[PDB]
């Protein structure tokens, strides 16, 4: 009174709109520019979400920053996978209600490859038939899934918070009709593979960010984050926390 799961549901940000002008044909540069700005704003929401997440603010401030910077992409990508799941059964990418990318719009030269790995995320929800509560739980667990090799400042606080939401995930499964053990295996397996698929998105992203000759614009929020997170990733100094080996 109140249950953790109903706190998750209530703190979940409303879906943001892109304001994309589709009067004239899509240019890949300007689609990516529009996405980045949508992205900035969604990250800003993610930051407010995380602050309201029970346990998060017990962490040292620097650790709050680190976690958000390390996982923003997997959060954004997972939530995208969710909107594409419920909205079009994973057939189209639902970035915003006024920016859906179907098979055609994807054929943009630069787009196709990145788009497939994003599509791979929604198909997983389709295949595993993920519920809302399962998703909400898996989403916080992504926020806590990518850490400095050197560990955090608040390691023991962290370790506990992770435990709590691991158990909250257990509850969302059980809540949803013995073999619940198997579900947990698959869900935690899905969380594991995010590292790989989000890998690629982060690759393109650093690429488009680093190579200013591309004309892909980033908002301040993302730029600050990317330019701080890039050296850390390249130096191979960050670590994924996995459930399986």
């Amino acid at each position: 009174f109140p249950t953790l799961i109903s706190l998750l549901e209530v703190i979940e940000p409303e879906v943001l709109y892109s304001g994309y002008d589709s009067t004239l044909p899509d240019t890949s540069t300007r689609l990516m520019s529009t996405l980045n700005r949508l992205g900035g704003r969604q990250v800003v929401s993610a930051v407010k979400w995380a602050k309201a997440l029970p346990g998060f603010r017990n962490l040292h401030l620097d650790d709050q920053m680190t976690l958000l910077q390390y996982s923003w992409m997997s959060l954004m990508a997972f939530s995208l996978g969710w909107r594409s799941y419920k909205q079009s059964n994973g057939n189209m990418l639902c970035f915003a209600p006024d920016l859906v990318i179907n098979e055609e719009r994807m054929q943009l030269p630069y787009m196709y490859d990145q788009c497939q790995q994003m599509l791979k995320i929604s198909s997983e929800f389709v295949r595993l038939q993920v519920s809302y509560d399962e998703y909400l739980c898996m989403k916080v667990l992504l926020l806590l899934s990518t850490v400095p090799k050197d560990g955090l400042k608040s390691q023991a606080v962290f370790d506990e918070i992770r435990m709590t939401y691991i158990k909250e995930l257990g509850k969302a499964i059980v809540k949803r009709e013995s073999q619940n053990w198997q579900r947990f295996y698959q869900l935690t397996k899905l969380l594991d593979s995010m590292h790989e698929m989000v890998g690629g998105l982060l690759q393109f992203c650093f690429y488009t960010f680093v190579n200013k000759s591309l004309s892909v614009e980033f908002p301040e929020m993302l730029a600050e984050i990317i330019s701080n997170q890039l050296p850390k990733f390249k130096a191979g100094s960050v670590k994924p926390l996995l459930f399986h080996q």
Partner: peptide, 11 residues
Amino acid sequence: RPAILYALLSS
């Protein structure tokens, strides 16, 4: 230090 991030995290 990402200034906007930090600004958000400290109220």
